[PDB]
């Protein structure tokens, strides 16, 4: 029937493909072999006698992590030809990841794109994950999206971007790779989701109460975001939400396709022992600016619209009561050209708790996707950062000699300034 | 003799329409396996209004169900009383409408209408003389308001003289789901005012109001709201399947509810309706059936009828009940709040009796009412829709698929002239 095909580019993409597909196997009930002890057809294939293989791709230019996947536990879950590996990385260079060391693996990746997408008709679209601050995450993720654009045009390309944080970068050439990824990302993306790492750093510190976790504990929460967003495709619900539902209701103009998400309740076993998780309590906690997972404060940003969607044993009466009280509260405010700004979906099957993971067994959960005009600051803070970098020729001697010319930098500056003017006129 | 062919579009109209067949199958003694039980002549002398004999003793529905998604089609089939429908009458869709009126009406809505127009006409001509078509859908999303009303247009140009009922769930005014609300609302109605004989206006949060206080349900699910609508559906067609002292068919309603072909918008509410404790206390009688109905709180539309004036209406009573106080209570209300009725009409709302009560009941009444007080409902959709067009919201899913802004201003003009047409009758 229907299917969605994931893309996992970058090292962040590989280990988010290890996390997201661990939760997908641990929800539908498939062992690491690939067997069981029709709702699973959305992500898994029907291979052989009762074996199910993921409908994803793993793209990376460095084998030190992706071979490390096919050496560990899930080495007989994925296809052997599935995990495509390069010989050397880009090393935080958009120039190599898009032009020189990148071109010899995109033909092999799109080889497995069409070989895995020609299985059954009903394909909703693609679901790509990348590291913007990384080199091969934005590098291969650039030209993979033009090639999907010229092959499968109308297909819904939904794209999770792990955007780099303002004062958390773990890199120095972040403003150079992030601008060149932005120049590739506006004209080729249907749906975009913002993931600033320092906000998931903080919503695990104050909400999960765990004070020193690692990158993989971030990947628990992002996997819970997708396992919310896409389970309405799989199981019965009061109001089913499709992949094609998102881009038909969250993008007002094709350039404002940058949406920002949140989740509730990010609650451990010892705070789920004490708070009732009512629909009113779980909705206003999702809109609390500390719980926002991209560090973009919406008090001074005007909400365009929003799409709440729920899981568990949620009654639609409490959905309409909770959605009304967040309308009537004054601290939130809307653009006056979009008075009706909320869309609700309901799924019945509660989120499964992963063992070892910090989350608790939650009886009902909320995922949220909002578009606003607060995205002006998340780029404007990067504009002063990059203009100050580019003033006196910082790190540009790599970028010139590795395939591209000076002038692509200025044209990537002009269209981010174009979306600066575009976001303010929406918010007038 | 007389036959009614059901059309259900959207998953809203399929859920609130499957319950219609669940109460009709309950009324006529049909099992979910299609076997009659209940050994009464008067439950079975009129089956053909909704069922056809299927050479196995199974009375199968005359219902065509259409959707652009199959996730709600198999949930109806797998539910109770869901195997009653013939599998060929299911109309599957593979692509799906993402709550856009343009795609449900032009691109793949027309790609499905060539396979749903043939199945509605196999059912239609098989009877000797069809009475009317009824449609049950919603204007919130895309596949109900874009393709259900396109089937409405195609059956009008094929069978013009036939009556054209529809039961539309308008989007809820103050609690807004389906975030592209006024596009799927206004772009359907101006194409619906020229292709519908009767339209019955029902709102979701009006059903939420009556479950909250008058019925006192602590957890009102969607299946609860579907049965408030469904109990109101059986009262409109009681005389079609049952005899009565004074009968009334659907076209008896159409002649006494609309004086002009331009307005055919009505207001539906059902009585009696009390809570579990209050049912054991309440007196079911002909006086205490009617002032519940002449009440804004009972109404299944979120437009207050006290704000305007009743032009015409109707009441269809049901049960073993007398006919004097049908009209003495009908005109005592016409004499006490006489400012609430228009002064240029005789005895403004009509009377009907159907001898068979709803199952379990001994007394009930339904009501179809054309009132000018639905203007605040249309105007609240109006100023939200114009707020969309001050700065051209969400246009690219409507422009690149085969229409333009000339039809947007056509939607504004063909809706505002009904606003002014309603404004000049008070």
């Amino acid at each position: 029937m229907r299917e969605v095909i994931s893309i996992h580019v970058g090292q962040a993409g590989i280990q988010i493909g290890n996390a997201c597909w661990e939760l997908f196997c641990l929800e539908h009930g498939i062992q690491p072999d690939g067997q069981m002890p029709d709702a699973f057809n959305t992500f898994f294939s029907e291979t052989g006698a009762g074996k199910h293989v993921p409908r994803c791709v793993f793209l990376d230019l460095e084998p030190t992590v992706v071979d490390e996947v096919r050496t560990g536990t899930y080495r007989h879950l994925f296809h052997p030809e599935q995990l495509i590996s390069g010989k050397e990385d880009a090393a935080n260079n958009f120039a190599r990841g898009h032009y020189t060391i990148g071109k010899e693996i995109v033909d092999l990746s799109l080889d497995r794109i069409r070989k895995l997408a020609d299985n059954c008709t009903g394909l909703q679209g693609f679901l790509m994950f990348n590291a913007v601050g990384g080199g091969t995450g934005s590098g291969l993720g650039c030209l993979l999206l033009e090639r999907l654009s010229v092959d499968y045009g109308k297909k819904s390309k939904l794209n999770f971007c792990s955007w780099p944080s303002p004062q958390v970068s773990t890199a120095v050439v972040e403003p150079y790779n992030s601008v060149l990824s932005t120049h590739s990302l506006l004209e080729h993306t249907d749906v975009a989701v913002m993931l600033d790492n320092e906000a998931i750093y903080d919503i695990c510190r104050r909400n999960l109460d765990i004070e020193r976790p690692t990158y993989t504990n971030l990947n628990r929460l992002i996997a819970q975001v997708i396992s919310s967003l896409t389970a309405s495709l799989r199981f019965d619900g009061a109001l089913n939400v499709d992949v094609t539902e998102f881009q038909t209701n969250l993008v007002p103009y094709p350039r404002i396709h940058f949406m920002l998400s949140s989740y509730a309740p990010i609650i451990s076993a010892e705070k789920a022992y004490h708070e009732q998780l009512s629909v009113a309590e779980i909705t206003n906690s999702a809109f609390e600016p500390a719980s926002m997972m991209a560090k973009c404060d919406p008090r001074h940003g005007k909400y365009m619209a929003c799409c709440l969607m729920y899981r568990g044993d949620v009654v639609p009466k409490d959905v309409n009561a909770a959605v009304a009280t967040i309308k009537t509260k004054r601290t939130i405010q809307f653009v006056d050209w979009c008075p009706t700004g909320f869309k609700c979906g309901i799924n019945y099957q509660p989120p499964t708790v992963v063992p070892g993971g910090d989350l608790a067994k939650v009886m009902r959960a909320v995922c949220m996707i909002s578009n606003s005009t607060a995205i002006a600051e998340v780029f404007s803070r990067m504009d002063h950062k990059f203009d100050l970098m580019y003033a006196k020729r910082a790190f540009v001697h790599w970028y010139v000699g590795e395939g591209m010319e000076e002038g692509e930098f200025s044209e990537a500056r002009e269209d981010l300034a174009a979306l600066e003017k575009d976001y303010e006129e929406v918010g007038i | 003799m007389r036959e009614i062919v059901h059309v259900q579009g959207g998953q809203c109209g399929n859920q609130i329409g499957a319950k219609f067949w669940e109460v009709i199958s309950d009324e006529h003694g049909i099992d979910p396996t299609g076997t009659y039980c209940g050994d009464s002549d008067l439950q079975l002398e009129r089956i053909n209004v909704f069922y056809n004999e299927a050479t196995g003793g199974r009375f199968v529905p005359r219902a065509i169900l259409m959707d652009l998604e199959p996730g709600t089609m198999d949930s109806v089939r797998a539910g109770p009383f869901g195997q009653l429908f013939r599998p060929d009458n299911f109309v599957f869709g593979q692509t799906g409408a993402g709550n856009n009126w343009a795609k449900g009406h032009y691109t793949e809505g027309a790609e499905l209408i060539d396979s749903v127009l043939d199945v509605v006409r196999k059912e239609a001509e098989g009877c000797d003389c069809l009475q009317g078509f009824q449609i049950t859908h919603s204007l919130g999303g895309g596949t109900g308001s874009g393709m259900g009303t396109l089937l409405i247009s195609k059956v009008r140009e094929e069978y013009p003289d036939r009556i054209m009922e529809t039961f539309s769930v308008f989007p809820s005014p103050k609690v807004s789901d389906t975030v592209v609300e006024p596009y799927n609302a206004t772009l359907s109605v101006h194409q619906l005012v020229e292709n519908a004989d009767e339209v019955q206006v029902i709102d979701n949060e009006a059903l939420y109001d009556i479950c909250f206080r008058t019925l006192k349900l602590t957890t009102p699910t969607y299946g609860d709201l579907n049965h408030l609508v469904s109990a109101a559906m059986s009262g409109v067609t009681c005389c079609l399947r049952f005899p009565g002292q004074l009968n009334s068919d659907l076209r008896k309603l159409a002649v006494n509810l609309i004086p002009f072909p331009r307005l055919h918008f009505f207001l539906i509410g059902f009585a009696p309706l009390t809570s579990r404790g209050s049912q054991q206390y309440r007196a079911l009688s002909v006086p205490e059936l009617t002032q519940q109905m002449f009440d804004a709180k009972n109404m299944m539309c979120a437009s207050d009828p006290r704000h305007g004036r009743y032009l015409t209406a109707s009441a269809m009573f049901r049960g073993r009940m007398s006919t004097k106080e049908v009209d003495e209570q009908m005109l005592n209300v016409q004499n006490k709040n006489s400012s609430y009725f228009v002064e240029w009409i005789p005895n403004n709302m009509k009377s009907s009796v159907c001898d068979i009560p709803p199952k379990g009941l001994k007394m009930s009444v339904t009501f179809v009412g054309n009132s000018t007080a639905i203007q605040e409902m249309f105007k609240r959709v109006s100023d939200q829709f114009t707020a969309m067009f001050r700065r051209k919201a969400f246009l690219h899913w409507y422009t690149g698929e085969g229409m333009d802004e000339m039809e947007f201003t056509e939607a504004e003009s063909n809706m505002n002239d009904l606003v002014s047409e309603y404004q000049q009758y008070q």
Partner: peptide
């Protein structure tokens, strides 16, 4: 299936007492 349930309202519109 779970989209639709008339089990409280079904008894609310029958005049029966437990």
């Amino acid at each position: 299936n779970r989209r639709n349930w008339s089990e409280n309202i079904e008894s609310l519109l029958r005049q029966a007492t437990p």
